[PDB]
Amino acid sequence: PLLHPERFVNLGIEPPKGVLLFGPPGTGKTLCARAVANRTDACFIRVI
Amino acid sequence: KGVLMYGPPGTGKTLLARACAAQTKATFLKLAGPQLVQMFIGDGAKLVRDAFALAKEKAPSIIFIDELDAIGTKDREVQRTMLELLNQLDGFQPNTQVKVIAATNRVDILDPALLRSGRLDRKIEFPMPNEEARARIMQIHSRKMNVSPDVNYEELARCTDDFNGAQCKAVCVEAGMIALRRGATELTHEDYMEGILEVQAKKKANLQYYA
Amino acid sequence: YDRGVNTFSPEGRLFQVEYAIEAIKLGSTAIGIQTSEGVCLAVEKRITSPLMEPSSIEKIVEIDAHIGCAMSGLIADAKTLIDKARVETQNHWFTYNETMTVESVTQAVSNLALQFGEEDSRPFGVALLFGGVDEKGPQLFHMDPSGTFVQCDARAIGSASEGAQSSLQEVYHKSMTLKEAIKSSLIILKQVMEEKLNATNIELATVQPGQNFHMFTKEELEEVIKDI
Amino acid sequence: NQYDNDVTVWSPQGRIHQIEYAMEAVKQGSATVGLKSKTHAVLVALKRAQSELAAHQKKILHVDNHIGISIAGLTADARLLCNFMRQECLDSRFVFDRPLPVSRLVSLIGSKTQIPTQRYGRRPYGVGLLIAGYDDMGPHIFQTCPSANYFDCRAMSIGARSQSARTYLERHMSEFMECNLNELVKHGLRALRETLPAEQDLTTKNVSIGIVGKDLEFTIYDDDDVSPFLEGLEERPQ
Amino acid sequence: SAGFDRHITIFSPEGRLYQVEYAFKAINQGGLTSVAVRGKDCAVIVTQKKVPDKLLDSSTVTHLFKITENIGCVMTGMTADSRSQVQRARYEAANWKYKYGYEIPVDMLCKRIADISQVYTQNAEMRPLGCCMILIGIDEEQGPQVYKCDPAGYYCGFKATAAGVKQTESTSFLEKKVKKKFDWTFEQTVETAITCLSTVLSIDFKPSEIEVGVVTVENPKFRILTEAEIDAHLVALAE
Amino acid sequence: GGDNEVQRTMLELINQLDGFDPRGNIKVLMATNRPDTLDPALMRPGRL
Amino acid sequence: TGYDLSASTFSPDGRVFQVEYAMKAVENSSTAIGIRCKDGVVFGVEKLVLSKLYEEGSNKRLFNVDRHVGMAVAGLLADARSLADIAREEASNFRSNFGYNIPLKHLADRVAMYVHAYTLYSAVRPFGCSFMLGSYSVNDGAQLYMIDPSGVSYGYWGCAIGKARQAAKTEIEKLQMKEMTCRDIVKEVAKIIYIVHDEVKDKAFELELSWVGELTNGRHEIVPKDIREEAEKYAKESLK
Amino acid sequence: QPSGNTSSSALMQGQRAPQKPSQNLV
Ligand SMILES: Nc1ncnc2c1ncn2[C@@H]1O[C@H](COP(=O)(O)OP(=O)(O)OP(=O)(O)O)[C@@H](O)[C@H]1O
Ligand SMILES: Nc1ncnc2c1ncn2[C@@H]1O[C@H](COP(=O)(O)OP(=O)(O)OP(=O)(O)O)[C@@H](O)[C@H]1O
């Protein structure tokens, strides 16, 4: 939705705005979060 | 002057209250219970009294109260706020042109705001979605999307049970995204069924001891 | 809440048989191949101690003069299946004075299997490979704890099942000879092993139409191995 | 949730959860359809493969010269009830020298499966039978469910994603009466492609057909005589 | 409180098991009340009938059951259990007559029922059949006998009996009534019964909603009083 | 005494997470290892 | 709550919960009405169609218990079928024992006792069917009886079972049933059925009628098609 | 579930007082 915002309006849906991540400890979450902060091309905010 | 209604949390009573507010012009005034507990000074008494004074001002006024019901049945703010509510409840003008709507999901305690002797009046129960409820809900929330004409909504209502309207909305959301995965031009009954499996995070495979 | 064999699930899935299905996962691998000339069968031995007697631990047992079985999974239950197989075969021969097809033997065994809670105990926890030569030629069948029949052209069971399945899929074809199948199976077994392959870790079995006897190879495995 | 434990307990809503939980056991297996004509009854089954080099599991199994059944669900109970079928038909033939009519056989099966859903110490039989037979009143198609309810139906379909077959049967219900075999077969098996996802098509390797007629004994075809039936059909409108 | 034995039949601390008390107070959901009295040559049972609709028949509601030619019974509590109980009693009486050659007295029959219930509650897996029992019968050199059986295996016979919902008041009223003098005459018994029910229920009785049954030395045969004769009795007592 | 303060804090997030005036191209990520101890009010359609 | 799981336990107040759970479970079945005229008994049942692929003869709720007894099952179907089998066996046993037709009252008591037998042990569950029995004899007239899963049995002039159990009997009782024959009852009960919410929010149904009394010489059977269709016409125009 | 629990504490904010200004502007 941040790069190609036409498919959703073309078909007629709306993009979600929230994702929760869960699994056992060590599974690999924070790594994916760090990965998306590399090719983000937008403001990123780390929160303590 | 005041009407209560209770039911399961999935009922979406907020929908009904909001739609009734749209169907009137009585200066819509809204409130939430927990947000009233502030700063350990029974401040909720001051906010309740402000609200009712404003209602008397804007005479065509509806009070909307939805959540707060615990008053310490097992905190010094909460008794004072219940006092403010209960006293102003029966201090209303007998002419009665302001109205009060209380829509809570619990009847878990009965100490606060007795429902008899004129303190409170009408009650409404809310059922859990019935058979027509599910079909109707999916059929309304799908209305924006392109849908194939032959979706047997009856089977969907059949398979849904213990499963409420908001989740039916979630299904209506999910079928579109699923279809976008394969670039589908419109939704199909299998897309809906896969959604009806997606929202509860189950996964389908070949178990290898059936059939 | 799957602490009962006699209980279903909110999605309809029995949660006791599945556990026995995965209990085979930690047995020992075993590979089998069907071919127009006959049936070939290979296993891993996985010896424990050098002080063991090698012949005391076995994986291939000959039910009859024209049928053989390979086993993986729990040790004790294999005996209870095998003796029943032998007894049934002899009873059928006595009544009808002929030899039955392997398919009926599998049928009798499975008919015993599916009584874990049917009568009036835990299900058996083993997996079996049946290989023989009936009137239709060579035959091979696979048997799992749920009591399900299936005929397979080539199959591997035990641990490393999926590891060897993909490798085996790419080289099999119907126009095949027994001599080449033995070599291919041994190559696969070499790749999947963790110990350096030799003549004291495997044991073969072959059955042929006109050579229904001699369901073993003994100490000529050295020349079968060296040419790899 | 504590009411969701066993078969002998009710619920404050007056339902028994175990029968409902056994109901979905029929939604795990493959899909199959059945229907009848003025003079013949035909059922069609989709055979599911296991792996690339394994034989496909069989669905249609022979019962008696005038009665056959399909199968959908668990495997153990399937073979158990098949054994019961054979035993009862053979006993009737031995005692009265006549074939047993289908309706009373179905009634006996309902009586048989009723007991476990009330006693303590046994699970219900989670299998979706479909019975096709011919008797003096003509062809007959019957269905059973784990809840011990047996229905008569002119056309039916069960298994995974079976509603599409139902809708197609509804929109073509009228003309099944007057058609004969060599078009009724393809008419019926046109219902399976809806079950199939749109990337693959029905082949000659994974389908079985069973037919029973007034003068034709119950016969099963697969993998060899399917080709005459699968030739000349309208491809899916993609 | 606490419930050590709330679920099954085992001993709590202080030695009081809790299922039988629940059985005892399960007797009141019938919503009825019955009285029984004894005079020197008569035995009388009185009870009321509730008919909440007109589509109900009138001959298929009576709780008065015939045990045998000289023994009659009345029931309380729930319904089906009563029918099972009377079936058992009929079976017992027939067997006794066949085995021994003379007639069953009321005492032995009552003891047989009590023993049945006791064995029934000693073991588990059986719900202790919650209904009360009242029987009357005439025998020689003892005269009229009235007895009552208890869902816990207790039994006793006594002059004035009440059961149902208002026993605590009817029994007290009968205590006050009987102390002055014995109800010698036949019709005084019916007097006392009707007056007791009228006072405890604080209402007079329309004849169509009352059932009474009497046995007398003149004719030990069990008999049910018809509408006309109860009309006569009521107008005689209520001038 | 001390505890209730944090309560206020979380509420100030929730009503600020939604309401009126769609926030827009602002996305939020939630990550945790212990999902079963979360307030159900977070799982409302529209928030997460 | 507790105390509501086993059928062999009492509540603190003193009532067993499983039987009344069965009571409130049977409510959802379709309403069937039994009525009696001075020379016969009439059974009427409403039966909802399912899908459009049914032959209309499935799920019959009228059973030939014996040569003169009627069956009016209502609830879960399989349990009803089992009870029908039990009643048939009992009737045949009595016929063999004494060589003449069972009286209605005796058979009703036997079946009620057998039904009651399943509310004591904790290894079984109570039945989920309440039904009716009816029979006409040249010697005893017309007899009706109704059985509920609790184990209570006694007669009526007219009763109904289903969702509108009281609503139907509200307008059934305004009929002076004591003196008209069942030929008029056949046409009026169809209207009785059509009165109460038959297809207000449903898709379709179908009605079946039984016949037993003096006219058939003590025989019990389904009504002939012509009379039933005529009653259908009268009722549907009456609805207008 | 009986209680033998404990808790932390927030501070007392009110501490400030006014002071005489000492600005020097001509
Ligand atoms: N699929 C994977 N591919 C590569 N590395 C992985 C993968 N899964 C886990 N790791 C490794 O896991 C380590 C840490 O993972 P990560 O920090 O994502 O864990 P986490 O699930 O966020 O844990 P926690 O919830 O305790 O914070 C990294 O060294 C990363 O390389
Ligand atoms: N009958 C209904 N028809 C359509 N949508 C409904 C219905 N009931 C609930 N919803 C859905 O529920 C949501 C709004 O309900 P909401 O979340 O306010 O529930 P509520 O029960 O009123 O809340 P609360 O927990 O505060 O009592 C929307 O997504 C709406 O679509």
Ligand SMILES: [Mg+2]
């Ligand atoms: Mg992390």
